[PDB]
């Protein structure tokens, strides 16, 4: 019923382990009744600016995640969502679905029990949990390479797996870096070089897919692993990277290193933690990403229609 | 009347060309009933993860400048504000006061008119002209020092002045960079290294104050000038710098080179535009800033008990 010239889009921000999740509830434009990843492209091609003035400055910052609110094509599930971040669109988002679970059920929309979720990369099940946490049984994960030689410019040779688990990563576990919260602007210009690296070589995943996400392990005497995680954006993930321990699990469990059922405990840069877990499936492993989300604001963004930054600044 | 285990920090969030900041309308300690400055002094130092919460991830980010809403001393003023930033404490705020008495009229308590706020450098005079834009008379400012020789490690000779516009700024000419928005982390780089000059050269404002900001400026075929300006906690500012826009008229007055009541239009690094003007003074110059803010969201931050990065993660 508002009147004045400006555009109100209604967002709920949550954390995962300290990685952001910004989920629109409303305000963004019409995007047809497809599947979420259709509506994903049309979103992209035809109304990217909404991304933007949600994600970036100043409304936003570089390290943001956002999540679309969709109706879903199937009645049997709780939501549809799109993620997209500071450079473009994701294809699942591990520690965003968690945000989106425990923000409905904060919205009134669920409660504990099983809700499937439809993302443009296919439809995951989350359980929420009795305690409000989430666990995540994502789409099927797999490596498509092992042990690859890579000369990273500026730092020397390394070696690491290509991976999806609802993105593609490269993962390595011999990269020489240190990773600690307190040295990411070191790791932030290691993981950039790789990346330089993977596009100078043409290395590619499946079908050419670009690997714009690379994963950093470490020993940690607290828990299985600690990662430093860089994202399409050239933010880092605050988070274990849902999408990316589903990865490194396909990694593990064709190596032999993690049984069916085991539970590997993940942390993050930051010292956050996700527990993970898989089963064997057809082509792959189905890997389930369990973690905590907390609230932490609830607004509406204003968009003037006489304010040249309305859209973002870019 | 909420008794959920969360605080509430009620904001609303503006731009002033395109520079933000964060109004806290509610949700604060307590800091006592003395000047900005006592008010200023007790936040640091008791309640400082009031200033992370709002400033830093997950809920802020580094380029974000907060303004506390405050009773003032004078029942003759419109408000106290106290400014801080990812660092720590600004000591006046240009871009911030813009959007401060631009977002007062938004919540009905002040109409177009001449409008005190109290700050911990002293009293400065709003005028909200009719078309919502706001000039700011600020506190007096002056040169401190001329043409200062620093060697600027990775870099090479420059010529700096020093001055006070309601923080303290080193101001270059000569410092040879590319003045652009698709240029700024080679500015950001350099001006940092200005900084760690200043640093190892014991070079001070009066009486050994911080010099904690950095302005390059560069000639502009549209305006007066271009300026990149680095802040105390390394992000750049995307206004023309309402202080070190200040701090720049003293140094053109006391060169001679702009006269009392003449305008001078100062641009960004990303274009927007504040003209400035000044009067002569006792010891320096009072100066006028003009700009124009933007609202760009209305938010109750989210402070749960539980959440382990409730303060931000620092
Ligand atoms: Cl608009
Ligand atoms: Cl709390
Ligand atoms: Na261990
Ligand atoms: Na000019």
Same mark, same amino acid.
């Given at each position: 019923?508002?009147?004045?010239?400006?555009?109100?889009?209604?967002?709920?921000?949550?954390?995962?382990?300290?990685?952001?999740?910004?989920?629109?509830?409303?305000?963004?434009?019409?995007?047809?009744?497809?599947?979420?990843?259709?509506?994903?492209?049309?979103?992209?091609?035809?109304?990217?600016?909404?991304?933007?003035?949600?994600?970036?400055?100043?409304?936003?910052?570089?390290? #943001?995640?956002?999540?679309?609110?969709?109706?879903?094509?199937?009645?049997?599930?709780?939501?549809?969502?799109?993620?997209?971040?500071?450079?473009?669109?994701? /294809?699942?988002?591990?520690?965003?679905?968690?945000?989106?679970?425990?923000?409905?059920?904060?919205?009134?929309?669920?409660?504990?029990?099983?809700?499937?979720?439809?993302?443009?990369?296919?439809?995951?099940?989350?359980?929420?949990?009795?305690?409000?946490?989430?666990?995540?049984?994502?789409?099927?994960?797999?490596?498509?390479?092992?042990?690859?030689?890579?000369?990273?410019?500026?730092?020397?040779?390394?070696?690491?797996?290509?991976?999806?688990?609802?993105?593609?990563?490269?993962?390595?576990?011999?990269?020489?870096?240190?990773?600690?919260?307190?040295?990411?602007?070191?790791?932030?210009?290691?993981?950039?070089?790789?990346?330089? /690296?993977?596009?100078?070589?043409?290395?590619?995943?499946?079908?050419?897919?670009?690997?714009?996400?690379?994963?950093?392990?470490?020993?940690?005497?607290?828990?299985?692993?600690?990662?430093?995680?860089?994202?399409?954006?050239?933010?880092?993930?605050?988070?274990?990277?849902?999408?990316?321990?589903?990865?490194?699990?396909?990694?593990?469990?064709?190596?032999?290193? #993690?049984?069916? /059922?085991?539970?590997?405990?993940?942390?993050?840069?930051?010292?956050?933690?996700?527990?993970?877990?898989?089963?064997?499936?057809?082509?792959?492993?189905?890997?389930?990403?369990?973690?905590?989300?907390?609230?932490?604001?609830?607004?509406?963004?204003?968009?003037?229609?006489?304010?040249?930054?309305?859209?973002?600044?870019?």
């Amino acid at each position: 019923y508002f009147q004045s010239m400006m555009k109100r889009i209604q967002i709920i921000d949550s954390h995962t382990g300290g990685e952001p999740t910004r989920l629109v509830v409303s305000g963004f434009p019409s995007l047809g009744s497809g599947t979420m990843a259709e509506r994903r492209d049309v979103l992209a091609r035809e109304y990217d600016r909404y991304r933007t003035a949600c994600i970036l400055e100043p409304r936003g910052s570089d390290v #943001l995640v956002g999540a679309l609110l969709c109706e879903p094509v199937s009645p049997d599930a709780a939501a549809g969502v799109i993620f997209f971040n500071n450079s473009g669109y994701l /294809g699942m988002c591990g520690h965003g679905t968690i945000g989106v679970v425990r923000t409905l059920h904060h919205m009134g929309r669920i409660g504990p029990g099983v809700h499937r979720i439809e993302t443009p990369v296919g439809t995951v099940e989350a359980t929420l949990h009795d305690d409000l946490s989430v666990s995540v049984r994502n789409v099927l994960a797999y490596r498509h390479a092992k042990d690859v030689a890579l000369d990273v410019p500026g730092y020397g040779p390394v070696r690491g797996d290509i991976a999806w688990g609802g993105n593609w990563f490269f993962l390595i576990s011999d990269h020489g870096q240190r990773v600690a919260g307190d040295n990411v602007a070191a790791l932030t210009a290691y993981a950039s070089a790789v990346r330089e /690296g993977l596009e100078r070589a043409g290395i590619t995943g499946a079908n050419g897919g670009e690997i714009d996400h690379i994963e950093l392990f470490a020993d940690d005497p607290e828990h299985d692993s600690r990662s430093f995680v860089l994202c399409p954006g050239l933010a880092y993930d605050r988070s274990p990277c849902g999408t990316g321990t589903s990865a490194k699990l396909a990694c593990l469990a064709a190596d032999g290193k #993690l049984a069916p /059922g085991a539970v590997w405990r993940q942390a993050s840069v930051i010292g956050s933690v996700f527990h993970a877990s898989y089963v064997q499936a057809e082509g792959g492993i189905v890997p389930t990403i369990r973690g905590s989300a907390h609230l932490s604001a609830e607004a509406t963004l204003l968009i003037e229609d006489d304010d040249p930054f309305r859209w973002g600044i870019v």
